[PDB]
Amino acid sequence: GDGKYGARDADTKIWNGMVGELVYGKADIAIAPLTITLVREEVIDFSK
Amino acid sequence: GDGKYGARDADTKIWNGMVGELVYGKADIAIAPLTITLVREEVIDFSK
Ligand SMILES: N[C@@H](Cn1cc([N+](=O)[O-])c(=O)[nH]c1=O)C(=O)O
DSSP, X not given: XXXXXXXXXXXXXXXXXXXXXXXXXXXXXXXXOOOOOHHHHHHSOOOO | OOOXXXXXXXXXXXXXXXXXXXXXXXXXXXXXXXXXXXXXHTTSOOOO
16 A cells, blocks of 8 residues: 555554565465565564 | 484484483584474474
8 A cells, every 4th residue: 555565653553565565464474575574574474 | 423414203203312312301402503494304303
């Protein structure tokens, strides 16, 4: 929707982007050039 | 114990090396230049 990868807002604590459409249930699997980071490995699972 | 990395025998179905000393309960964690492969992930978990 918002055309973004994914990072957490510092204020609203709201995850946006691809990651956001996962943790909020709006999608099941994410296939895109998403970068494996720490804060992301905490909220979602990553393949190799 | 055998100085090997970790591969499975095709005849006897045994795991040698560090993968083996993990799957057979000899060690708790394998910190070494151990290549992440499809067959190795199938018996022991790998970190990123
Ligand atoms: N690390 C690899 C084993 N391994 C090691 C070396 N090495 O010693 O640099 C190599 O050249 N090639 C190889 O397959 C593995 O874990 O399978």
